[PDB]
PDB file of C-alpha atoms in Angstrom:
ATOM      1  CA  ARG X 212      91.935 132.115 113.547  1.00  0.00           C
ATOM      2  CA  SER X 213      88.655 133.782 114.607  1.00  0.00           C
ATOM      3  CA  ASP X 214      88.531 135.772 117.351  1.00  0.00           C
ATOM      4  CA  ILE X 215      85.277 134.451 118.907  1.00  0.00           C
ATOM      5  CA  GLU X 216      86.754 131.165 118.813  1.00  0.00           C
ATOM      6  CA  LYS X 217      90.121 132.090 119.781  1.00  0.00           C
ATOM      7  CA  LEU X 218      88.303 133.268 123.215  1.00  0.00           C
ATOM      8  CA  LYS X 219      86.816 130.020 123.642  1.00  0.00           C
ATOM      9  CA  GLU X 220      89.901 127.853 123.700  1.00  0.00           C
ATOM     10  CA  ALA X 221      91.462 130.096 126.382  1.00  0.00           C
ATOM     11  CA  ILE X 222      88.443 129.709 128.503  1.00  0.00           C
ATOM     12  CA  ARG X 223      88.829 125.710 128.038  1.00  0.00           C
ATOM     13  CA  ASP X 224      92.644 126.203 128.633  1.00  0.00           C
ATOM     14  CA  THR X 225      91.560 127.860 131.808  1.00  0.00           C
ATOM     15  CA  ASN X 226      89.126 125.725 133.277  1.00  0.00           C
ATOM     16  CA  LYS X 227      91.448 122.982 133.101  1.00  0.00           C
ATOM     17  CA  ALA X 228      94.055 124.864 134.905  1.00  0.00           C
ATOM     18  CA  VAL X 229      91.097 124.986 137.114  1.00  0.00           C
ATOM     19  CA  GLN X 230      90.629 121.124 137.173  1.00  0.00           C
ATOM     20  CA  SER X 231      93.858 120.577 138.254  1.00  0.00           C
ATOM     21  CA  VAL X 232      93.904 123.061 140.791  1.00  0.00           C
ATOM     22  CA  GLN X 233      91.148 121.226 142.329  1.00  0.00           C
ATOM     23  CA  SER X 234      92.635 117.835 142.325  1.00  0.00           C
ATOM     24  CA  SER X 235      95.473 119.487 144.297  1.00  0.00           C
ATOM     25  CA  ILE X 236      93.063 120.503 146.828  1.00  0.00           C
ATOM     26  CA  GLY X 237      91.468 117.083 147.001  1.00  0.00           C
ATOM     27  CA  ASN X 238      95.141 115.965 147.724  1.00  0.00           C
ATOM     28  CA  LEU X 239      95.921 118.495 150.648  1.00  0.00           C
ATOM     29  CA  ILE X 240      92.545 117.292 152.215  1.00  0.00           C
ATOM     30  CA  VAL X 241      93.841 113.747 152.374  1.00  0.00           C
ATOM     31  CA  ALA X 242      97.302 114.806 153.356  1.00  0.00           C
ATOM     32  CA  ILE X 243      96.192 116.771 156.318  1.00  0.00           C
ATOM     33  CA  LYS X 244      93.943 113.890 157.165  1.00  0.00           C
ATOM     34  CA  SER X 245      97.176 111.812 157.482  1.00  0.00           C
ATOM     35  CA  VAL X 246      98.602 114.272 159.934  1.00  0.00           C
ATOM     36  CA  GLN X 247      95.109 113.926 161.911  1.00  0.00           C
ATOM     37  CA  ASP X 248      95.251 110.242 161.745  1.00  0.00           C
ATOM     38  CA  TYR X 249      99.128 110.390 163.040  1.00  0.00           C
ATOM     39  CA  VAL X 250      98.580 112.298 166.067  1.00  0.00           C
ATOM     40  CA  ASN X 251      95.303 110.747 166.785  1.00  0.00           C
ATOM     41  CA  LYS X 252      96.472 106.860 166.630  1.00  0.00           C
ATOM     42  CA  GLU X 253     100.690 107.516 167.145  1.00  0.00           C
ATOM     43  CA  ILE X 254     101.269 110.343 169.102  1.00  0.00           C
ATOM     44  CA  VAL X 255      98.274 110.453 171.434  1.00  0.00           C
ATOM     45  CA  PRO X 256      98.958 107.258 172.729  1.00  0.00           C
ATOM     46  CA  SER X 257     102.511 107.971 173.418  1.00  0.00           C
TER      47      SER X 257
ATOM     48  CA  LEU D 110     107.379 105.854 167.142  1.00  0.00           C
ATOM     49  CA  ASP D 111     107.651 105.446 163.234  1.00  0.00           C
ATOM     50  CA  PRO D 112     107.899 108.928 161.003  1.00  0.00           C
ATOM     51  CA  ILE D 113     105.309 110.449 159.773  1.00  0.00           C
ATOM     52  CA  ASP D 114     105.027 110.397 156.188  1.00  0.00           C
ATOM     53  CA  UNK D 115     102.819 111.801 152.569  1.00  0.00           C
ATOM     54  CA  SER D 116     105.594 112.290 149.958  1.00  0.00           C
ATOM     55  CA  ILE D 117     103.731 110.211 147.193  1.00  0.00           C
ATOM     56  CA  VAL D 118     100.536 112.602 147.775  1.00  0.00           C
ATOM     57  CA  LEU D 119     102.444 116.259 148.195  1.00  0.00           C
ATOM     58  CA  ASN D 120     104.806 115.111 144.891  1.00  0.00           C
ATOM     59  CA  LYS D 121     101.344 114.624 143.209  1.00  0.00           C
ATOM     60  CA  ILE D 122     100.307 117.876 144.190  1.00  0.00           C
ATOM     61  CA  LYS D 123     103.532 119.606 142.317  1.00  0.00           C
ATOM     62  CA  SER D 124     103.153 117.492 139.265  1.00  0.00           C
ATOM     63  CA  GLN D 125      99.259 118.568 139.210  1.00  0.00           C
ATOM     64  CA  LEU D 126     100.350 122.400 139.933  1.00  0.00           C
ATOM     65  CA  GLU D 127     102.781 122.083 137.130  1.00  0.00           C
ATOM     66  CA  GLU D 128      99.617 120.752 134.408  1.00  0.00           C
ATOM     67  CA  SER D 129      97.896 123.423 135.901  1.00  0.00           C
ATOM     68  CA  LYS D 130     100.870 126.370 135.015  1.00  0.00           C
ATOM     69  CA  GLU D 131     101.198 124.753 131.399  1.00  0.00           C
ATOM     70  CA  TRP D 132      97.084 124.911 130.762  1.00  0.00           C
ATOM     71  CA  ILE D 133      97.573 128.673 131.589  1.00  0.00           C
ATOM     72  CA  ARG D 134     100.352 129.307 129.532  1.00  0.00           C
ATOM     73  CA  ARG D 135      98.335 127.609 126.878  1.00  0.00           C
ATOM     74  CA  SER D 136      95.507 130.252 128.027  1.00  0.00           C
ATOM     75  CA  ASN D 137      97.389 133.231 127.722  1.00  0.00           C
ATOM     76  CA  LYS D 138      99.230 132.321 124.602  1.00  0.00           C
ATOM     77  CA  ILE D 139      96.377 132.074 122.846  1.00  0.00           C
ATOM     78  CA  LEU D 140      94.942 135.796 124.508  1.00  0.00           C
ATOM     79  CA  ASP D 141      97.912 137.204 123.254  1.00  0.00           C
ATOM     80  CA  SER D 142      97.103 136.641 119.786  1.00  0.00           C
ATOM     81  CA  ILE D 143      93.668 138.593 120.389  1.00  0.00           C
TER      82      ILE D 143
ATOM     83  CA  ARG O 142      86.366 148.817 124.477  1.00  0.00           C
ATOM     84  CA  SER O 143      84.676 146.265 122.138  1.00  0.00           C
ATOM     85  CA  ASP O 144      83.176 143.682 123.457  1.00  0.00           C
ATOM     86  CA  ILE O 145      86.009 140.974 122.279  1.00  0.00           C
ATOM     87  CA  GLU O 146      88.833 143.180 123.842  1.00  0.00           C
ATOM     88  CA  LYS O 147      86.781 143.137 127.300  1.00  0.00           C
ATOM     89  CA  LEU O 148      86.105 139.366 127.459  1.00  0.00           C
ATOM     90  CA  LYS O 149      90.017 139.005 126.698  1.00  0.00           C
ATOM     91  CA  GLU O 150      91.319 141.283 129.490  1.00  0.00           C
ATOM     92  CA  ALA O 151      88.449 139.422 131.562  1.00  0.00           C
ATOM     93  CA  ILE O 152      90.211 136.306 130.805  1.00  0.00           C
ATOM     94  CA  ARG O 153      93.526 137.480 131.504  1.00  0.00           C
ATOM     95  CA  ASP O 154      92.484 138.856 134.694  1.00  0.00           C
ATOM     96  CA  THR O 155      90.693 135.316 135.556  1.00  0.00           C
ATOM     97  CA  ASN O 156      94.127 133.908 134.879  1.00  0.00           C
ATOM     98  CA  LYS O 157      96.064 135.952 137.278  1.00  0.00           C
ATOM     99  CA  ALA O 158      93.772 134.694 139.891  1.00  0.00           C
ATOM    100  CA  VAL O 159      94.273 131.136 138.868  1.00  0.00           C
ATOM    101  CA  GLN O 160      98.173 131.690 139.116  1.00  0.00           C
ATOM    102  CA  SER O 161      97.900 133.359 142.393  1.00  0.00           C
ATOM    103  CA  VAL O 162      95.746 130.300 143.641  1.00  0.00           C
ATOM    104  CA  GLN O 163      98.705 128.058 142.293  1.00  0.00           C
ATOM    105  CA  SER O 164     101.087 129.907 143.967  1.00  0.00           C
ATOM    106  CA  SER O 165      99.116 129.626 147.557  1.00  0.00           C
ATOM    107  CA  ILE O 166      99.132 125.721 146.816  1.00  0.00           C
ATOM    108  CA  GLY O 167     102.442 125.405 146.316  1.00  0.00           C
ATOM    109  CA  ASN O 168     103.155 127.208 149.583  1.00  0.00           C
ATOM    110  CA  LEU O 169     100.309 125.113 151.450  1.00  0.00           C
ATOM    111  CA  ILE O 170     103.136 122.056 150.259  1.00  0.00           C
ATOM    112  CA  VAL O 171     105.592 124.108 151.697  1.00  0.00           C
ATOM    113  CA  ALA O 172     103.623 124.816 155.355  1.00  0.00           C
ATOM    114  CA  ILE O 173     102.623 120.436 155.339  1.00  0.00           C
ATOM    115  CA  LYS O 174     106.422 120.010 154.643  1.00  0.00           C
ATOM    116  CA  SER O 175     107.257 122.137 157.585  1.00  0.00           C
ATOM    117  CA  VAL O 176     104.392 120.031 159.790  1.00  0.00           C
ATOM    118  CA  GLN O 177     106.133 116.872 158.984  1.00  0.00           C
ATOM    119  CA  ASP O 178     109.376 118.099 159.513  1.00  0.00           C
ATOM    120  CA  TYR O 179     109.100 119.277 162.829  1.00  0.00           C
ATOM    121  CA  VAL O 180     107.049 115.979 163.691  1.00  0.00           C
ATOM    122  CA  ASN O 181     110.064 114.026 162.906  1.00  0.00           C
ATOM    123  CA  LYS O 182     112.682 115.944 164.304  1.00  0.00           C
ATOM    124  CA  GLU O 183     111.146 117.426 167.411  1.00  0.00           C
ATOM    125  CA  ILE O 184     108.026 115.085 168.516  1.00  0.00           C
ATOM    126  CA  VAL O 185     109.802 111.651 167.391  1.00  0.00           C
ATOM    127  CA  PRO O 186     112.705 111.604 169.137  1.00  0.00           C
ATOM    128  CA  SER O 187     111.351 113.450 172.211  1.00  0.00           C
ATOM    129  CA  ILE O 188     108.604 110.617 172.410  1.00  0.00           C
TER     130      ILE O 188
ATOM    131  CA  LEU U 181     110.412 121.597 172.871  1.00  0.00           C
ATOM    132  CA  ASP U 182     110.346 124.357 171.018  1.00  0.00           C
ATOM    133  CA  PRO U 183     107.078 125.475 170.137  1.00  0.00           C
ATOM    134  CA  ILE U 184     106.394 125.012 166.085  1.00  0.00           C
ATOM    135  CA  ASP U 185     106.482 128.096 163.802  1.00  0.00           C
ATOM    136  CA  UNK U 186     105.300 128.503 158.948  1.00  0.00           C
ATOM    137  CA  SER U 187     104.048 131.902 160.052  1.00  0.00           C
ATOM    138  CA  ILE U 188     105.549 133.111 157.115  1.00  0.00           C
ATOM    139  CA  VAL U 189     104.578 131.122 154.502  1.00  0.00           C
ATOM    140  CA  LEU U 190     100.960 130.878 155.959  1.00  0.00           C
ATOM    141  CA  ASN U 191     100.831 134.922 155.774  1.00  0.00           C
ATOM    142  CA  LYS U 192     102.041 134.155 152.136  1.00  0.00           C
ATOM    143  CA  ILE U 193      99.499 132.048 151.383  1.00  0.00           C
ATOM    144  CA  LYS U 194      97.074 134.744 152.676  1.00  0.00           C
ATOM    145  CA  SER U 195      98.825 137.487 150.786  1.00  0.00           C
ATOM    146  CA  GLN U 196      98.542 135.580 147.497  1.00  0.00           C
ATOM    147  CA  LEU U 197      94.851 134.311 148.301  1.00  0.00           C
ATOM    148  CA  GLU U 198      93.581 137.999 148.424  1.00  0.00           C
ATOM    149  CA  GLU U 199      95.243 139.109 145.192  1.00  0.00           C
ATOM    150  CA  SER U 200      93.504 136.223 143.684  1.00  0.00           C
ATOM    151  CA  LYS U 201      90.259 137.332 145.006  1.00  0.00           C
ATOM    152  CA  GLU U 202      90.738 140.706 143.771  1.00  0.00           C
ATOM    153  CA  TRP U 203      91.498 139.355 140.429  1.00  0.00           C
ATOM    154  CA  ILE U 204      88.485 137.944 139.981  1.00  0.00           C
ATOM    155  CA  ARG U 205      86.404 141.032 141.186  1.00  0.00           C
ATOM    156  CA  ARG U 206      88.199 142.830 138.555  1.00  0.00           C
ATOM    157  CA  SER U 207      87.094 139.939 135.657  1.00  0.00           C
ATOM    158  CA  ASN U 208      83.587 140.181 136.906  1.00  0.00           C
ATOM    159  CA  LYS U 209      83.494 144.000 136.756  1.00  0.00           C
ATOM    160  CA  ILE U 210      85.044 143.643 133.360  1.00  0.00           C
ATOM    161  CA  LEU U 211      82.291 141.456 132.409  1.00  0.00           C
ATOM    162  CA  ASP U 212      79.826 143.390 133.858  1.00  0.00           C
ATOM    163  CA  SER U 213      80.650 146.225 131.369  1.00  0.00           C
ATOM    164  CA  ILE U 214      79.535 143.768 128.527  1.00  0.00           C
TER     165      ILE U 214
ATOM    166  CA  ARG K 271      71.927 133.142 122.679  1.00  0.00           C
ATOM    167  CA  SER K 272      74.760 135.469 121.089  1.00  0.00           C
ATOM    168  CA  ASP K 273      78.243 134.227 120.919  1.00  0.00           C
ATOM    169  CA  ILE K 274      79.505 136.910 123.071  1.00  0.00           C
ATOM    170  CA  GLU K 275      77.157 136.708 125.537  1.00  0.00           C
ATOM    171  CA  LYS K 276      77.962 132.929 125.540  1.00  0.00           C
ATOM    172  CA  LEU K 277      81.276 133.613 126.292  1.00  0.00           C
ATOM    173  CA  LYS K 278      80.593 136.308 128.916  1.00  0.00           C
ATOM    174  CA  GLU K 279      78.350 133.697 131.253  1.00  0.00           C
ATOM    175  CA  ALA K 280      81.042 130.724 130.402  1.00  0.00           C
ATOM    176  CA  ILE K 281      83.251 133.382 131.844  1.00  0.00           C
ATOM    177  CA  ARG K 282      81.075 133.720 134.867  1.00  0.00           C
ATOM    178  CA  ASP K 283      81.033 130.364 135.632  1.00  0.00           C
ATOM    179  CA  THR K 284      84.737 129.796 135.473  1.00  0.00           C
ATOM    180  CA  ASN K 285      85.042 132.395 137.984  1.00  0.00           C
ATOM    181  CA  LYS K 286      82.203 131.308 140.582  1.00  0.00           C
ATOM    182  CA  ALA K 287      84.632 127.952 140.361  1.00  0.00           C
ATOM    183  CA  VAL K 288      87.607 130.063 141.332  1.00  0.00           C
ATOM    184  CA  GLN K 289      86.068 131.747 143.958  1.00  0.00           C
ATOM    185  CA  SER K 290      84.776 128.501 145.411  1.00  0.00           C
ATOM    186  CA  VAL K 291      88.066 127.200 145.198  1.00  0.00           C
ATOM    187  CA  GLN K 292      89.561 130.415 147.186  1.00  0.00           C
ATOM    188  CA  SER K 293      87.036 129.539 150.040  1.00  0.00           C
ATOM    189  CA  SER K 294      88.975 126.528 150.420  1.00  0.00           C
ATOM    190  CA  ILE K 295      92.065 127.746 150.412  1.00  0.00           C
ATOM    191  CA  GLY K 296      90.702 129.392 153.350  1.00  0.00           C
ATOM    192  CA  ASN K 297      89.581 127.232 155.058  1.00  0.00           C
ATOM    193  CA  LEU K 298      92.968 125.053 154.186  1.00  0.00           C
ATOM    194  CA  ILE K 299      94.665 127.940 156.482  1.00  0.00           C
ATOM    195  CA  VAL K 300      92.108 127.493 159.406  1.00  0.00           C
ATOM    196  CA  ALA K 301      92.996 123.583 159.014  1.00  0.00           C
ATOM    197  CA  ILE K 302      96.621 124.256 159.504  1.00  0.00           C
ATOM    198  CA  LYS K 303      96.168 126.973 162.340  1.00  0.00           C
ATOM    199  CA  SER K 304      94.361 124.330 164.306  1.00  0.00           C
ATOM    200  CA  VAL K 305      97.011 121.763 163.813  1.00  0.00           C
ATOM    201  CA  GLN K 306      99.990 124.221 164.710  1.00  0.00           C
ATOM    202  CA  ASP K 307      97.732 125.505 167.870  1.00  0.00           C
ATOM    203  CA  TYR K 308      97.219 121.624 168.673  1.00  0.00           C
ATOM    204  CA  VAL K 309     101.165 121.283 168.930  1.00  0.00           C
ATOM    205  CA  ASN K 310     101.765 124.213 170.707  1.00  0.00           C
ATOM    206  CA  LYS K 311      98.944 124.125 173.130  1.00  0.00           C
ATOM    207  CA  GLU K 312      98.646 119.932 174.029  1.00  0.00           C
ATOM    208  CA  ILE K 313     101.887 118.178 172.614  1.00  0.00           C
ATOM    209  CA  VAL K 314     104.575 120.533 173.606  1.00  0.00           C
ATOM    210  CA  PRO K 315     103.471 121.020 177.260  1.00  0.00           C
ATOM    211  CA  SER K 316     102.556 117.084 177.096  1.00  0.00           C
ATOM    212  CA  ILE K 317     106.212 116.352 176.458  1.00  0.00           C
ATOM    213  CA  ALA K 318     107.567 119.069 179.042  1.00  0.00           C
ATOM    214  CA  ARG K 319     105.823 117.724 182.045  1.00  0.00           C
TER     215      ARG K 319
ATOM    216  CA  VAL A 239      99.566 112.314 180.261  1.00  0.00           C
ATOM    217  CA  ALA A 240      96.136 111.916 179.446  1.00  0.00           C
ATOM    218  CA  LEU A 241      95.694 114.085 175.843  1.00  0.00           C
ATOM    219  CA  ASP A 242      92.806 115.257 173.669  1.00  0.00           C
ATOM    220  CA  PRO A 243      92.529 114.344 170.435  1.00  0.00           C
ATOM    221  CA  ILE A 244      93.038 116.635 167.724  1.00  0.00           C
ATOM    222  CA  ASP A 245      89.958 117.799 166.243  1.00  0.00           C
ATOM    223  CA  UNK A 246      88.934 120.113 162.558  1.00  0.00           C
ATOM    224  CA  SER A 247      86.114 118.002 160.478  1.00  0.00           C
ATOM    225  CA  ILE A 248      83.783 120.599 160.490  1.00  0.00           C
ATOM    226  CA  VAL A 249      87.024 122.697 159.043  1.00  0.00           C
ATOM    227  CA  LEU A 250      87.933 120.194 156.433  1.00  0.00           C
ATOM    228  CA  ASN A 251      84.394 119.109 155.844  1.00  0.00           C
ATOM    229  CA  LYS A 252      83.951 122.500 154.290  1.00  0.00           C
ATOM    230  CA  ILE A 253      87.103 122.271 152.198  1.00  0.00           C
ATOM    231  CA  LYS A 254      85.272 119.021 150.386  1.00  0.00           C
ATOM    232  CA  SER A 255      81.943 120.658 150.226  1.00  0.00           C
ATOM    233  CA  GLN A 256      83.511 123.762 148.474  1.00  0.00           C
ATOM    234  CA  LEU A 257      85.625 121.573 146.203  1.00  0.00           C
ATOM    235  CA  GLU A 258      82.793 119.847 144.992  1.00  0.00           C
ATOM    236  CA  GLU A 259      80.824 123.001 144.831  1.00  0.00           C
ATOM    237  CA  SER A 260      83.802 124.261 142.363  1.00  0.00           C
ATOM    238  CA  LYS A 261      83.488 121.128 140.472  1.00  0.00           C
ATOM    239  CA  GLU A 262      80.340 121.844 139.183  1.00  0.00           C
ATOM    240  CA  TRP A 263      80.833 125.546 138.130  1.00  0.00           C
ATOM    241  CA  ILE A 264      83.459 124.142 135.785  1.00  0.00           C
ATOM    242  CA  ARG A 265      80.988 121.776 134.524  1.00  0.00           C
ATOM    243  CA  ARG A 266      78.671 124.554 133.814  1.00  0.00           C
ATOM    244  CA  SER A 267      81.433 126.511 132.052  1.00  0.00           C
ATOM    245  CA  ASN A 268      82.441 123.875 129.609  1.00  0.00           C
ATOM    246  CA  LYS A 269      78.633 122.987 128.764  1.00  0.00           C
ATOM    247  CA  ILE A 270      78.296 126.919 127.554  1.00  0.00           C
ATOM    248  CA  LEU A 271      81.356 126.126 125.622  1.00  0.00           C
ATOM    249  CA  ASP A 272      79.357 123.441 123.665  1.00  0.00           C
ATOM    250  CA  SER A 273      76.807 125.962 122.410  1.00  0.00           C
ATOM    251  CA  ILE A 274      79.166 128.284 121.237  1.00  0.00           C
TER     252      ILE A 274
END
């Protein structure tokens, strides 16, 4: 219940929040890349 | 032409985004005690 | 004004920045979903 | 074909992002006091 | 070496990580804008001709 | 009609790089929290 120990646990939780945000970003890159792959191979030759 | 699809990918971002919100909920929960 | 009080408020602000980023990501999904919907409902039938 | 539009969602992303950048600026300024 | 100092520096690293994420979102906006412009400037007139 | 392919590889490249730099910043934050 120490003040300093309570502060560390909040930063550790905040870091895990950031890590999942980073995973989300990586998947947004895959999503957008899927759009570029879909028009460069399916729409442009059509 | 076949319709475009990454529903699996977008659903994974929704799921990951909910985990991020829960971590913030844990953090703000501890700060309220200080 | 204690050093612990400042550390707490700084984390409170960092969490709010992360919450704002979380919102912007949810909207990026909506944005990408609207691009998917336009392709499958305007481009595909026409082509 | 009608041109594609998410101008409203793209603007919400912009405003939420700049709101995020301000919360960090206050956090770093609070840490500057220590 | 103090605990308050260690806590302060950890939040600095965390804040930098958030700033780097904010830039990546900024370029994601640009990435989506590139797609919107390509649809309205290359695909729409292509199917209209 | 003959259509130029869509290009933002440089646009997406920064994100992938800005993502990796963010991963390392969290690693350093967690590393300081070990000594506390």
